[PDB]
Assembly symmetry: D3
């Protein structure tokens, strides 16, 4: 199953991301279940918002919110929930939510999948609008769900993103 997908071929520079939610999709917040590897409906989000990129996680990692580390993956066409994409980290939106520190990595498709993103080396190379849209999404998408909240702490670079990937991997390792 997806439970057996490696974190990556050469972490943290070469990772696999398991997709749960496509970019620009209906507000169904799917999460993979750790036990079964199945896609569960976590919730129907209450705001009229969509994820600006495909959204998922790195397998065999653990954030402080008790889930694998979260990843946004821009692509030319939305991905299928439950599919896996090889990518390269380029930046990270630091943020905290009701479940703990909960960073949002941005990783682009690996050069082997496409040349489209090769030019995006670091966080400054991401379009300013996309970055603004992502921060605005995480700032507001929980606005109508009581007991759910976010404190966005800011954008950081590809090396901070890599550091977060290592830490999350090591954390799933030693817990």
């Amino acid at each position: 199953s997806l439970l057996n997908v490696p974190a990556g071929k050469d972490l943290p520079e070469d990772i696999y991301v398991v997709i749960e939610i496509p970019a620009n999709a209906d507000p169904i917040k799917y999460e993979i279940d750790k036990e079964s590897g199945a896609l569960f409906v976590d919730r129907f989000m209450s705001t009229a918002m969509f994820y600006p990129c495909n959204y998922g996680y790195i397998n065999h990692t653990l954030s402080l919110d008790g889930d694998p580390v979260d990843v946004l993956v821009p692509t030319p066409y939305p991905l299928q929930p439950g599919s896996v994409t090889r990518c390269r980290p380029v930046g990270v939106l630091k943020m905290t939510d009701e479940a703990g520190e909960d960073a949002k990595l941005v990783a682009v498709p690996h050069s082997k999948l496409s040349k489209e993103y090769d030019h995006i080396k670091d966080v400054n190379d991401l379009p300013e609008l996309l970055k603004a849209q992502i921060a605005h999404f995480f700032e507001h998408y929980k606005d109508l769900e009581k007991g759910k909240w976010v404190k966005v702490e800011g954008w950081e670079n590809a090396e901070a993103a890599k550091a977060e990937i290592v830490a999350s991997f090591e954390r799933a390792k030693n817990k």
Copy 2:
């Protein structure tokens, strides 16, 4: 063309709404052009948000923002931009934006189109979530567009909605 569509068969209780944007659609903000009756792209909205209902206007009306009065129309399936739907007003979100007072009517499909909405007589009969989603949309959808802004002033009932329809009609009449 759509330029020749009546405001309604018996205003303000029985109106026609010209749809510009479907519910739950991509963030393309279409507006009908007054001159040609064609659907123009006003803009690509910058936030990752969607209209909670189909969105358009009552022909032969004028708001203080210099456009025909705006209407949200809930339906079971999204409508085609440029189509026209017979409806019944049930409530209004009072609000102001950078172009003037700019109320958002809510009108449901007429009984003749469907029985689904007959039970919605007044604003209190609208689902609380939908109303919350609409106010949250108008509060935030201009957050990333400089020089565009909104002050949401609150929900009011079917009679206030009807009053607004009359006023907007009379205004297109005497300007």
Copy 3:
């Protein structure tokens, strides 16, 4: 507007069909308004059914149900409501509904648009499943709408279809 589209380049063998409803679409029953040429929502259909083909009419014709003659147009991909397709009649489903005799022509895309349908010369060349699906649709799609009903009278050939096209044209002519 669509109000000015000819019935066809050489009726009844070479016709234009104005599309109102795409094949396999949501159950929104659009009808063009004769006055304005705009697409109106006639109703939200109540059964969980879809049109097996794109559905519309021949302009400048009149059936006994007081509307232009109805046409089903099979295509490889669903058409846009309000678009126009050049076609060739191949058969007709005779039927009556609450508004009068109300035949359903089947016309395929003209050879100039595609070679795909050239082999369909007459009604027997239509797939048996499609014909069965169309009759079953018209038999049941009004089952949950009181005061709406259908009596399906059977399939007839391309020459009967042509005769119906002529009659409907002549009727719009002399009324």
Copy 4:
């Protein structure tokens, strides 16, 4: 795999439903294969009909038609085939088909996923149109498939639905 999903967290009041067919989808009748847990095409349905709700089953149950008990799940947006949704039973359409007694449960998203359905406590709280659409679907969707048929026996309440869930669970247990 989906083969390992529990019937529920607290049956019969708190269940999981494995979705096979989304609401308002193309007429591809997917069924999960018991052996592999994969989604198989059972058939391409022959009528021009769609499921009024998402459709699937409760894992680790068995109906008299030799399959897990069937469930319809209304949601605001169609679900992905192969996804799992936590729900609450509210009613049941009793019916028989060519494979045995084959009830159709209706279960709404659990409060934890959404508040939208909390107000639906029992079968009378379901919209009359949706219930009519579901009965009409099961009455007719097999009309063009020889050797497939249905006898719809009627709507019953949340306690009958719960009783059916218990019986189906116990049956998978003791066979």
Copy 5:
């Protein structure tokens, strides 16, 4: 109708493009009819190809193929056939087809619609992949339609694109 849309607010730098075909759509080749302003199906294209950008024309212009000058418009989300978008020319693919010289302009959404494309000043600023995809599309999309063909002659810059816009306008003027 769309027949009355200006070529632009300040040609050739500020133009309007009437869209006939969305980006990444089914292979239905719609063309606006000059007489009626309606969207007609020109043909169902025979290759398994899609337009890499939204496709349409500048009103009140004339190419040597006897149609208004053709335009590709990249956008973040596909546009509706029959809609109009304000844009800025940035490049041109020179090519000839069976109907005459038939250049393909590329024009991006005007800054007023979006800031996304402001950075694209000239043809070299267009992504190399998109340009390659467009040339490959026009080279092959007529491969399976006998009597239809293309000779692609190459990419040229924003000033050549502007020159072509002027010439096409002047040609509709003096014929």
Copy 6:
């Protein structure tokens, strides 16, 4: 998982095909991963092309390109990536690509799923356009990916298709 799906119920006449890419979809080239059974993004294809049929493979087979044998499956509606369809082989497009001989089987839905394809007994019964579209797709879809290429060698009949299925099965058996 899909790793455990049989090659078929009675090879080579009665096979199962695991679908990776739907017909007429976005150009995301998914491949099932042999290790995990998960759907991976192999690449984002560079040409503006789509698969004319659903595309996938026969499990427990091996081609000379080191992957299971490839299959195109025409259906009335596109299939879900990761779903499985029972089918009957009717023809084969012989071709070679950069990874080895790499035939493309065509197999239609089994009679048990639908009667629609029963009339297609052999390769000559496939529509000429579909066959032309498939050959044109494989001839050009790698045109913009350096180091990827195809030599299409021609269409052959249902018995050649069956022979290829046997050979590929036996090859996965003895390697």
